[PDB]
Structure formats: structure tokens, C-alpha cells
Design a protein around this ligand. Sequence first.
Ligand SMILES: NC(=O)c1ccc[n+]([C@@H]2O[C@H](COP(=O)([O-])OP(=O)(O)OC[C@H]3O[C@@H](n4cnc5c(N)ncnc54)[C@H](O)[C@@H]3O)[C@@H](O)[C@H]2O)c1
Ligand SMILES: NC(=O)c1ccc[n+]([C@@H]2O[C@H](COP(=O)([O-])OP(=O)(O)OC[C@H]3O[C@@H](n4cnc5c(N)ncnc54)[C@H](O)[C@@H]3O)[C@@H](O)[C@H]2O)c1
Ligand code: NA
Ligand code: NA
Lengths: 320, 320
Amino acid sequence: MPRVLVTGALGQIGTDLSLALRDKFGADSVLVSDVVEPGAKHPLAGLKGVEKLDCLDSNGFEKLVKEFKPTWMYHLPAIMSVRGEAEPDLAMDINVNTTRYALELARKYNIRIFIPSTIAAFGDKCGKTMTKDDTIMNPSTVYGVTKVYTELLGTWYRQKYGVDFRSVRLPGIISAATLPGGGATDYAIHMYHSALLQKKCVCPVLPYESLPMMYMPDTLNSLVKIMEAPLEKLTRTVYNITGFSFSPSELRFSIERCTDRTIEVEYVEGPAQKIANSWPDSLDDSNARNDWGHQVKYDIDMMSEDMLRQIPILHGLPSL
Amino acid sequence: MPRVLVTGALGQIGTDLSLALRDKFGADSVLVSDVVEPGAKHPLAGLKGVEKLDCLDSNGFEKLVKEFKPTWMYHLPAIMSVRGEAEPDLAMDINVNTTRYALELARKYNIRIFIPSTIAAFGDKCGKTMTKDDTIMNPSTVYGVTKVYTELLGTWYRQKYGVDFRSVRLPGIISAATLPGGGATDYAIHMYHSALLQKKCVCPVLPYESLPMMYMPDTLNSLVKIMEAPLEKLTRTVYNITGFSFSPSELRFSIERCTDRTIEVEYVEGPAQKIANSWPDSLDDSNARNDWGHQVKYDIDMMSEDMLRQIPILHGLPSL
Ligand SMILES: NC(=O)c1ccc[n+]([C@@H]2O[C@H](COP(=O)([O-])OP(=O)(O)OC[C@H]3O[C@@H](n4cnc5c(N)ncnc54)[C@H](O)[C@@H]3O)[C@@H](O)[C@H]2O)c1
Ligand SMILES: NC(=O)c1ccc[n+]([C@@H]2O[C@H](COP(=O)([O-])OP(=O)(O)OC[C@H]3O[C@@H](n4cnc5c(N)ncnc54)[C@H](O)[C@@H]3O)[C@@H](O)[C@H]2O)c1
Ligand code: NA
Ligand code: NA
């Protein structure tokens, strides 16, 4: 049974991952942290082992690692695709420098370390249909650039020092509990809110821009599964994973068929569209399926149904 | 015509390019800077147009760009392949943070900016025969990882801000003036010194390990040429360029022809061998040839004859 450290824990992924790990391994085995404190309505308010730590504070990060002695780390802090174009200084500081600290500490303290990549690591030369694990990487956002740097530097730590570095290229992740940072796939979460609130959604991704996507339960499954796998089962450090692909028009159809209500949607092309246009439509994740058993339980309608049930309960929005 | 700032100007490439730029444009149009001062023996010693600047100091870097007002920048400082593996914190700071300040200044101050990349950006999935401009980048050195970053970041500045960023992936560069900075191809330069001193060469690279190489004069030509080209002539931001490939054994023979005398090399793998073996054997530089006229005037024996003459003159070793 591992001791698990999660950084950037109050975000979209960390919120749910923190809870899944605690319930799988017990709360005493799981320490989580973030640059800020949870608000009183955050799902991690009031839980112990939830610390304040700025990962840009090298010394603090090392003090926490020293004191807790994790055997696993999920290093989740990142400024994301859309926000990063607006705050590229912040993107480069966090995505480069925290990642560099997390790797050195993994090396120094003998930690199996997970740092997520993303479909944003790809750009327009990747081969957008069923994009492979190994291809040309020409990301067109600074976030993507820092993510390729992350894959490569982590892979360098594995080969140079034997650090057990593992990663997946996350597709767009959909969840109910905590709202998304500043990403291009955020529209997909926002559309469910808009539908429950009965208010017009202004969508900055164009209606037929397909992206790889996944629902959180599947994502959690896979984030635990790749960290549990014996290193000998892994043929690579970085794996594509996908759930299913969809476009905004498709998601809208899904939501409408579950609510039996039309939703008002105005499509604009914000920065999210030009970014998302540079990304794959779909991924090939067969290496992940084959090496460690990546699997997806949810399709789009099962996800919409769960999201429509959970958001009212978790956020108080207009229910049934 | 241009005003040219060179940073990292006192190293192997910067020494000769600084001189060539001054010749071409007038000493008044060229400002060269480095974190150290030239030593008494240095080709740039006691010249005007030679400043002291540490490029990690972002305000200092900006101060000098504000005072000099370049239209062109050659940003050369980097920790290289072999020295990087030994001192990776140093390599990560310089190669990532100085590049970042330099791009940021090129944007703010409307500067056409060159930052070299390298064959070290490639790794063992690149396709090592006539390696292409677009391919898999899996560098096995932190130097290489930082250079992929450099490529992608400069290109993102181009795409996002309209920064005129240009780069070549340099092969191993050979010259006599200033001794090399701790790369995997330094054995070449050192084999010339061994021969002239009639001492035994300890070569850390294996005898038949082919690598792309180029002799300086050709290199100086291309670096000025890619910077002269009208932007509309450029189809990309990053170009492979090569001179000719050689292995240590071919270089031995070329020194031997030129000296009409046996020269004694002992092959004893150091860290350079694994690094070099992960690199290309040869590069396809047809895009560079076609877009802006990359061209190569020396072959191996012309380089050796020139090198065996200049090293005694410039370093005061025994002659012919
Ligand atoms: N959610 C998705 O759709 C998605 C998709 C692909 C990849 N990812 C990756 O997963 C990771 C988490 O993403 P997310 O969606 O949870 O992001 P998020 O923005 O929802 O949360 C990021 C968390 O990091 C914390 N943080 C920021 N700076 C920090 C610092 N200096 N020190 C400590 N904590 C800091 C933030 O406060 C926030 O709690 C990132 O690496 C992201 O790139 C997410
Ligand atoms: N020499 C080659 O064969 C070769 C091959 C491929 C790429 N390159 C690239 O060309 C560039 C120059 O290489 P080089 O061989 O001339 O390296 P070098 O080691 O000879 O010179 C580097 C110079 O950078 C200076 N420097 C270091 N830190 C600095 C800082 N903070 N601020 C200002 N200056 C600093 C050093 O004083 C040194 O003079 C590098 O980016 C290198 O990667 C060189
Ligand atoms: Na997001
Ligand atoms: Na060198």
C-alpha cells in the first residue's frame, strides 16, 4: 500500500483524484496540497492531510516530501491551454519550474512520479485522426510546449537516473465536482450548467470541432491503474489515453436528448477554437490498452445523464 | 542595414561570428556580450563593442537591448551535451531561462532573433539516415530536451506574436579559434591538437560513429544568410543544416593524409559515445538549401589542412 502525494490538488482533476485515492488507500496514506486553501464548500474542505504549499517554493516542497515520505506522487499543477496564451509567464513558471522541482524530489526521495501530459502537446502535424503515441509534436500553445518539455524531461529523468516517471496524454476531462481551470474543453462542462440553469451557452469552440474526451470515473480508473502497474509492463513513459471523441454539436444533442429540452447555444470562435483546431480529432490509445489495461466504461449519454444528476446535487443548481 | 546583438559571444561559435559580423557590417553595428570578459589571448580582447552581460538577469538583458536597439539578435549561450549531463541544473537554467528572456525581448523590441538548435534535439527514433526537418524528437540529453523546448517556444513566439524567429539545427561545428564548450563532438577539435603536439589522442567516441559536422566558415556563411533572407522566402522557423558526416576514424585518416605521418588514437568510451550514438548519422538539409541557399564549401581534407595551419598560429603549438 503506497503513500501518495498529490500537488495542485484543489483543481478539477485533483479534487476527484484526492477522494478516490483516500477511499482506495485510506486517508492516512494520502497527503494532498495546493497553493491555496479550500473554500468552505470545496469537496476537500474539512479533511485532514490537505496542506497549503506553493510548488514554486522549492524548500517547502522538499520539506513536505521529507516529512511525508511518499512512494507515489501525482504532480498536477499547471496553467492550462486558454489561460496560458493569456498568461504565458505564469504558464512557463508553473509548468516548467514546478515540474522540474517535482522530478528532482522524485529522484532524491525515491518516488514513483506521475505528471500528466495532454492532447495539447500535439499540433497540426501530428496526424489528427487516431493520432499515435510517437509522432511529430508541434504544439501551438505555450501550454503544449511546456507539456512536451514535461514529457521529454521526465523521460530524461527515467533514462538518466532511473526515476519511475509515468504519464498519459489526457484528453478533455469532464466532471461535475470542481470547475475547470482555463482550458479549451471547458465549454463541455459549462454547457451542462447552462442547460440546468436554462441560460444561453456561448460556446467558443465551433460546432464540428471534434476532440478526444473522457468522463472522470474512467480517468480516475486509469490514473490509479497506470501507477499500480509493474514497471516491467510499461513499454514507454508517456501514453495516449482517450474515452470517446465528440464535438460541441454532438454534446449538445446528447444533453438535449437527456433533458428533452432544447438548449440555447451561440457558437463563436474564441481563442479556444483556434487552439482546439490544432489538436487531434481522435487518439490511438492501444499501447495504453495493451500495456496496462486502460479501459473506458462511459459513453457520451451515460456521461450526460450522470452530469445532469450530479451538478444540481453538488452545486445546488435547478434539479429534476 | 542591421544592428546586431550577439549574446554568448565569447564561446566557440560566437568568437568567429562576432568577427565575421563586424567585418560585414562595421564594428559600430555589432554589439557582442558574454557573461565573462575576453581573456588577453582572446580574438575579441581589447575591442570596443564588447560588453559583460549575464543573460539570466532579465532586467540587465533588457537594459542592454533598450540602449543598443538591435534589429538582429544571435542568442548563443548554452550549456552543451556532455557538460549538461554532469551539470543539469546549470543546463536547465541557462538553456531555458535565457532563451525565454531573449524571446520576450525580441517581441517587445521588434527584433529578428536567431537561436541555434542542434542535432542533439534528435534521439534514436528520429530516423538516423538523412534525418528530416519534421520527425520524432526524443532527445536523450537534457541539452537536447532544452533545445526541443527552444525550437517550440521560438516557433510559438512566431505563431502567436509575429516574432521573426529563425533557427538551424547545427551539426558538430569544427574550428580553431576558441576551444569547444563540452559537447560530444569536441574530440574532433582535440584530435588536431594531439597530432600537432604528437601526443596520443584519447577519443571517447567510437571509431565508426558517424555524425553530421561542418567547418566554421561554412557555418558563418549560413548564419548570416538565414538572417539576411526576406521573411517570405522562409517556409519554416527551424532548419536542419549540414556540411558532411564523418566518424572519428575518417577524421584520423584525413589528419594522416594531411600530415603524411601516422597519428595514434586510442578509443576509450566516455559519456560522449552513448550521446553521439543516439544522434543522426546524416541530415537532410534540402529545405535550407532551397529556401535560403545553404551551401557548403569545405570537405574533410580542406578542413584538416586549414585546421592544422591555424591551430599552431592561434594556440602557439608546434607546426605543419
Ligand atoms: N482537466 C482537464 O481537461 C485536463 C486535460 C488534460 C491535462 N490536464 C492536466 O492535469 C493537471 C491538472 O489540471 P486541472 O484540470 O486539475 O487544472 P486546474 O486549473 O483545475 O487546477 C490546477 C491546480 O494547481 C494549483 N496550482 C497552481 N499553481 C500552483 C502552484 N504554484 N503550486 C501548487 N499548486 C498550484 C491550482 O491552484 C489548481 O488547484 C494539469 O497538469 C493539466 O495540464 C487536465
Ligand atoms: N559548437 C557546436 O558544435 C554547436 C553545435 C550545435 C549547437 N550549438 C549552439 O550554439 C550556441 C553556442 O555554442 P558554443 O559552442 O559557441 O558554446 P560555448 O560553450 O563555446 O559558448 C557559450 C558561451 O555562453 C556564455 N554563457 C554561459 N552562460 C551565460 C549567460 N548566463 N549569459 C551570457 N553568456 C553566457 C559562456 O561564457 C560561453 O562563452 C549554443 O546554443 C550551442 O547549443 C553549438
Ligand atoms: Na480543462
Ligand atoms: Na562542441
